[PDB]
A paper describes a structure:
CB-839, unlike BPTES and trans-CBTBP, is asymmetric across its center and has multiple unique moieties, including the replacement of the terminal phenylacetyl groups with a pyridylacetyl group and a trifluoromethoxylphenyl acetyl group, as well as the substitution of a pyridazine ring for one of the two thiadiazole rings. The complex structure for cKGA:CB-839 was determined at 2.1 Å. Two molecules of CB-839 are found to be interacting with the cKGA tetramer. Similar to BPTES and 1S, 3S-CBTBP, several hydrogen-bonding interactions mediate the binding of CB-839 with cKGA. Notable unique interactions include the hydrogen bonds between the pyridazinyl and acetyl groups of the inhibitor with the side-chains of Try394, Lys320 and Asn324 from cKGA. Furthermore, the thiadiazol group of CB-839 is also involved in a water-mediated interaction with Asp327 of cKGA. The terminal moieties of the inhibitor–fluorine and oxygen atoms of the trifluromethoxy phenyl group, as well as the nitrogen atoms from the pyridine ring of the inhibitor are not engaged in any hydrogen bonding contact with cKGA. Hydrophobic interactions between the aliphatic linker of CB-839 and the side-chains of Phe322 and Tyr394 from cKGA also contribute to the binding. In comparison, the driving force for CB-839 binding is the higher number of hydrogen bonds and this is assisted by the hydrophobic interactions from the pyridinyl ring. The terminal electron-withdrawing trifluoromethoxy group of CB-839, substituted on the phenyl ring on BPTES, deactivates the aromatic ring system and increases the electronegativity of the pyridazinyl nitrogen atoms, thus strengthening the hydrogen bonding interactions.
Glutaminase is a mitochondrial enzyme that catalyzes the first step in glutamine-dependent anaplerosis by converting glutamine to glutamate, more simply referred to as glutaminolysis. GLS1 has two full-length splice variants, kidney-type glutaminase (KGA) and glutaminase-C (GAC), whereas GLS2 encodes liver-type glutaminase (LGA). Others and we have reported that BPTES inhibits KGA by binding to an allosteric site between a pair of homodimers, and this results in a dramatic conformational change in key loop residues (Glu312-Pro329) that render the tetramer inactive. Additionally, we determined the crystal structures of the cKGA (catalytic domain Ile221-Leu533 of KGA) in complex with the trans-CBTBP enantiomer (1S, 3S-CBTBP), and CB-839.
Residue numbers in the entry: 218 to 315, 319 to 531
Amino acid sequence: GSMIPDFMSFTSHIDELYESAKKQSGGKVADYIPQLAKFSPDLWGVSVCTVDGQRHSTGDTKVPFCLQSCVKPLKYAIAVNDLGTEYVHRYVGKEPSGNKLFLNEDDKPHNPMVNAGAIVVTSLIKQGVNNAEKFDYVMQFLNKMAGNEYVGFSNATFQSERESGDRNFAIGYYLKEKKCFPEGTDMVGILDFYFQLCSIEVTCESASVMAATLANGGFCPITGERVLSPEAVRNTLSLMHSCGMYDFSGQFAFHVGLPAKSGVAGGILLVVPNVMGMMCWSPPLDKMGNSVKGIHFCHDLVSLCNFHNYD
Ligand SMILES: O=C(Cc1cccc(OC(F)(F)F)c1)Nc1ccc(CCCCc2nnc(NC(=O)Cc3ccccn3)s2)nn1
């Protein structure tokens, strides 16, 4: 599957799109915790990792930042990989909401990409062991996805996220009341694990390798290791396609047509199946919560290389 005939000319076009996006100065850096409000609005990085293992970065691609919602497709993939589609979707829905409600009509969170869904997915991983082992288990998994490149942890983000996460505690108690967790779940402990996962740190470079693992049918392109089952990958990409960009998800599926997942740190994890993974990062967000520069870049990328799913 050679739709990138000349990698060096392709990176030349990446750089031009990078420079064009750089001029987009709009948006607001998230500031509900100090660990996000700190970030400069001018940070802007794009990293590419093909399914071959070819790499290209431009801009601020080695500055660590928190995954935040970008971790949601990754922990869903781990859950499906270990437990199968059917078991996971006993607890969480499979489609966009069209949203302030915690649960759909079946008393399940709408999908794994919204907070209530990610909290339920978190309760499914490595059940029975304590939180330190749960975290270590997911960390080892993310190391394999990233081919052992930068995966860190921001204790300061974790502490601030947990102390100000009233909406997530409201979701936690509502899900407990509607019996959404597996039997024996310690809800407060699940919220802790959830806040920790949101505080895992990557760079553009390490994250693009994670995305490239999803683009490569579950095989890490820079180690050849099998990390995720084909089922886990397929499921994760479908939900990223339809639910990955908050309230912009429907527009993004229509105009861009690639599986992607945004996050409040300004990251956009982007997958071009069978071609490449990308991570774009610029902290200033539009009013729907997506990185202004990243969105502009994603539109330009598809209008240039015919990467749209139905192109
Ligand atoms: O009940 C379900 C299935 C369901 C599916 C579809 C329709 C439906 O009927 C309903 F919309 F009327 F509820 C119910 N899910 C569910 C129900 C309750 C909850 C916990 C509560 C969610 C958090 C909120 N609390 N108050 C709110 N008020 C507003 O947002 C203000 C507003 C503005 C505009 C129009 C209406 N209100 S949000 N979480 N999830």
